[PDB]
Design a protein around this ligand. Structure first.
Ligand code: R0J
Ligand SMILES: *[C@@H]1O[C@H](CO[C@@H]2O[C@@H](C)[C@@H](O)[C@@H](O)[C@@H]2O)[C@@H](O)[C@H](O)[C@H]1NC(C)=O
Ligand SMILES: *[C@@H]1O[C@H](CO[C@@H]2O[C@@H](C)[C@@H](O)[C@@H](O)[C@@H]2O)[C@@H](O)[C@H](O)[C@H]1NC(C)=O
Ligand SMILES: *[C@@H]1O[C@H](CO[C@@H]2O[C@@H](C)[C@@H](O)[C@@H](O)[C@@H]2O)[C@@H](O)[C@H](O)[C@H]1NC(C)=O
Ligand code: CL
Ligand code: CL
Ligand code: CL
Lengths: 437, 437, 437
């Protein structure tokens, strides 16, 4: 869509809007299964027995791995979830008596089946590999007369089990993202199609398979009665196509000559924001979200739920309805923030700060303060010894002029070195130390 | 074992106990080796020469990689170690004159051998792959008459070297966890059995191979005199089966109507705790520890060693023997902490906070404040737009009633925005600003 | 070279010097290409058709993956770049009309070619795999008469495409480090040789291929007109062979008997420092830099550019030219920092702190305070329940005696719990609270 951006000279911040949400709100747990086989020398046979040893070792390795129950600025404000708690709950259910054999018979004549579990969970079940049938029908007649083509074919069919076992071996039975060995592209797509979700969610997931993989978990579960089972925990996107915007912030300092006499302020509420259920889902670690064109994929486990009035901080940081969060300091170091459609430059001290085009070099020299340049005609920005490439996605930027709010503060009573602060908190500290003077 | 949990309404925190320790306290270094070979066209031979090129390229790649010496709330309180310093020391010893050939002759007639190094280190040595013998006896007669079965067999035997070389290529010669290509499951188990440790440590490591892999390092060391050698650094668990407990904390705020008039406090001493040598090993980043049933695997490199009196903060946060660490703020945002056996809910402002069961939906609505619900009969908790699944492991929870200690503070003199603080420090700041008023 | 180290008893810090810089300052973007093929049963043929299905699935998988534009103490002071912004810009250029076919014809008769793009970018282009030619000439005659040797050969040639597709599938089309499947060791070396850089940079990159891989990105770009193209973003080292030094800091506390009466101070400016263009590039997260012998590889994106006067803080922390950054607290916990050539020990309270040799055990017991021991004759240091191995690289340490500056502060007016502070800031807070007393 149309991505747009606004820079607020008054608060050294920029908002990128036009994005659409895809928030993981829940989990769908499926049970993926591989059916196992209970079981002089020719050259072609010696390799078959070598591959068969790799197969038993993989089985006993996975059995040995399952002796234990499976487990695994404003970010510090986040709660603490247990991401695979739902999959582990389902996996705990697979250990009950004859619960495994319910699945075994469900998939006797199909590869995809839905099974109600004894506690009422309605899971999709998938037999992705019948090694039982291959080994019993093609390999067992030889062991109880070899060609080279079955050796090739066995290695191919056994390779998937060996790779699944490798992933679980270096990841303590819990992997993310979910590899194509756990679930092939076609398997996952068909799993998505049979999922109980909207046509909207099916289209979204099918068109973003790579993101679904990254937000999914594979939990090695049980080996019992010739059945290898691991739970695949898939994301549920209960919030879709709501407006999202990214808030970029950078430090705003006074620019006095006498070094150390300068005071700084930085909006700490940077990150992603998406409208969600009458509130705003705020993701302080914008690293958690994944952007595909204009679609933002986030996990609500790494969000706060804030009043929508938090959006007022962008137009009016002194608004009376929400207490905008800032941090203060006297550390006027130079840096840049690359935004969606431009660049914020916090230039202080003796630092060289410029913006350049690929064919003509420097086109703007910044002066001390916080400033901004859009990515039209600009390819790179330099702050000191650091070169930043700007994003070259298209979209209009708007420079909103306004006086830097740091000018409104008397440095002699300014409370520096406050991190978890806000506009009101800084006011009340000022008007206390003012009371003594 | 029996995991139990206690929630302290007074301080918005919960302790999970019943766990048993397995703390990595040291390192065991082994030297793993692969013996190398110094060395019209038929179809079967062209593939043999293609595989042989892959083998030389892997050798020269590993030689090119070794031109350099190998290298690689309260977390900020931690020291700073050098994790592979012991392996690198051993690897430095392998570069001495004829030191490589000591190993070469030790493993002439065995694959597992113990070798005393020239500085006195007593290392286990392992020849996991004799490519020398394979190439010289099966491949060299052909090059200096091809069947397809050796082409298959050569690719299999060479694959391990190619995979080891890949891992070292994308990891600058130092890998963790240690893959099954570095050390197969059977190789590691037998390596563990020949280790100089207790039957307790051998059983523990053999039953938790996947955890040993994650706490181990593979350090590519030397290629010299037809010997490829890399050091595998294995964990030593010098602390085993001592009591451990997990401390979960969440913010505790007043719940006044007038927004911004509320003060908050959070216990910052959350993480894992294990009794250890008359003190308490405290792991502030509980992400560092790995839980297998009731066994907690931690690394003492990411611990502080604290007086055992730190445990008093759970029963009496005002105790006179240890100065319990808290942080203060006015940031009353809502969130939840999922514990071992329940959930802490810090619910403030206008946030919807509930606890639900899978079959009947909402069963508890939280009111403003810090509260808790056990995982019996509860499957999920919701705070705002965030759904948390609770862990469904069994164990008894105890709700310990008590007045939230935040009520004991006058907001007008409460020192907010203190992170590295404590009960005594907040008292002494209060009684200073009180002195002026 | 000669690594040396100095410990400053007065400020509980140590500097390691003698290192040489290799700073990534820029990016070189190359376009790697793979030429694709538009396309009863014998046993040997059934496997060929199985491998051919793996090939189509890989193609449609990569097409499905590209529906979206590709994307991906003092660290908080850093700016925020967009690391693959330059590669994505080039990739955006490959989507223009007939721009793909410019590359297609450039590499018609060569595998390495330089192509000027329509916006003026001069990129190197590389055809690493002609699957088009293999499938059309060897496989198509069979499908439109099988031996086992082509089945083997096809699987080998198709394996690279399958592995590239796997990496892009679990990494949303953007990978780092760049694997040997993206770019083999010989391909990368030859790519480096044809790069437009100095003989100095070519030697440096060729001798540190593993570091180049870790600082590189592979960006899946386009599949169009039988051409698979992904951009490889290689580092440009515009700063080479300038002096670097590592600053290690640890907490400095008073050591009074009465617990809680102690005040602490820690230099927060720890990390790597390299001379760069008349300033100093400061890398606060020393984890970002990679050390190969005496060569330090860093990324200027994770640096601040500071006045070179920052170096004065090591000899004179009260110097009048630069305001040295410290943090304050009353949290006198014990810990150690392992340096390049020794160990800093911050020992407080009741903690056992010692230094040991492998053959003789304890050789030094530290007393309360901040102290240091060089790695000559010392193999391990113990602080509480934590054993640290010291680095055993050779080089001389110098112990610079001086009174711990924490003694210069009256605890009754000492401002504790200041994180983003400095020497001057602590002075001005003291002389304010002093004014009231
Ligand atoms: O380390 C922390 N501190 C010390 C501190 N105090 C500061 N003061 C100023 Cl002016 C500027 C930065 C400051 N920091 C560091 C910034 C932290 C971050 F990197 F996550 F952003 C915290 C202060 N309050 C709340 C949470 C805090 N955490 C986080 C959880 C460990
Ligand atoms: C609370 O304080 C506010 C601070 O604004 C200005 O900034 C500080 C750093 C000093 O310059 C201070 O003297 C200035 O006034 C005031 O604007 C505000 O009016 C005060 N509110 C009340 C109710 O007194
Ligand atoms: C030190 O201060 C303590 C603070 O307790 C209470 O909380 C603060 C926020 C205010 O309400 C304060 O007025 C209250 O007293 C005291 O409880 C304690 O007794 C004081 N100690 C001494 C020795 O004065
Ligand atoms: C500013 O304050 C400095 C502080 O030095 C000492 O440390 C503190 C904790 C107290 O002990 C204080 O009384 C001490 O003086 C002074 O050294 C410095 O001279 C002061 N500067 C001015 C201009 O007053
Ligand atoms: Cl960049
Ligand atoms: Cl969850
Ligand atoms: Cl160590």
């Amino acid at each position: 869509q149309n991505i747009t951006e606004e820079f607020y000279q008054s608060t050294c911040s920029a908002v990128s809007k036009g994005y659409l949400s895809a928030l993981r709100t829940g989990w769908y747990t499926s049970v993926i299964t591989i059916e196992l086989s209970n079981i002089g020398t020719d050259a072609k046979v010696k390799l078959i027995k070598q591959e068969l040893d790799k197969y038993k070792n993989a089985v006993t390795e996975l059995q040995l791995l399952m002796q234990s129950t499976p487990a695994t600025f404003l970010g510090f404000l986040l709660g603490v979830g247990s991401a695979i708690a739902s999959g582990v709950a389902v996996c705990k259910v697979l250990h009950l008596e004859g619960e495994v054999n319910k699945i075994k018979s469900a998939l006797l004549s199909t590869n995809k089946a839905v099974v109600s579990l004894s506690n009422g969970v309605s899971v999709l079940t998938f037999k992705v590999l019948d090694l039982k049938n291959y080994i019993d029908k093609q390999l067992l007649p030889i062991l109880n007369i070899s060609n080279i083509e079955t050796v090739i074919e066995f290695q191919q069919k056994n390779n998937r089990l060996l790779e699944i076992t490798r992933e679980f071996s270096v990841n303590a039975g819990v992997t993310t993202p979910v590899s194509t060995y756990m679930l092939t592209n076609s398997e996952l797509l068909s799993l998505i199609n049979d999922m109980p979700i909207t046509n909207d969610q099916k289209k979204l997931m099918s068109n973003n398979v790579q993101i679904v993989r990254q937000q999914s978990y594979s939990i090695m579960c049980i080996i019992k009665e010739e059945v290898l089972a691991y739970v695949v925990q898939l994301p549920l996107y209960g919030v879709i196509d709501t407006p999202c915007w990214k808030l970029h912030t950078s430090p705003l300092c006074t620019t006095n000559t006498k070094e150390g006499s300068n005071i700084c302020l930085t909006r700490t509420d940077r990150g992603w924001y998406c409208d969600n259920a009458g509130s705003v889902s705020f993701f302080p670690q914008a690293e958690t979200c994944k952007v595909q064109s204009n679609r933002v994929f986030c996990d609500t486990m790494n969000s706060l739920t804030l009043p929508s009035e938090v959006n007022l901080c962008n137009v009016d940081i002194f608004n009376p309805k929400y207490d905008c969060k800032i941090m203060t300091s006297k550390t006027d170091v130079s840096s840049s923030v690359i935004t969606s459609l431009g660049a914020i430059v916090s230039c202080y001290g003796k630092t060289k700060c410029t913006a350049s085009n690929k064919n003509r070099g420097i086109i703007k020299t910044f002066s001390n303060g916080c400033d901004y340049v859009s990515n039209k005609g600009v390819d790179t920005v330099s702050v000191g010894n650091t070169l930043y490439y700007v994003n070259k996605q298209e979209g209009k930027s708007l420079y909103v002029k306004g006086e830097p709010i740091i000018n409104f503060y008397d440095p002699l009573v300014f409370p520096s070195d406050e991190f978890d602060a806000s506009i009101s908190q800084v006011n009340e500290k000022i008007n206390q130390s003012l009371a003594f003077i």
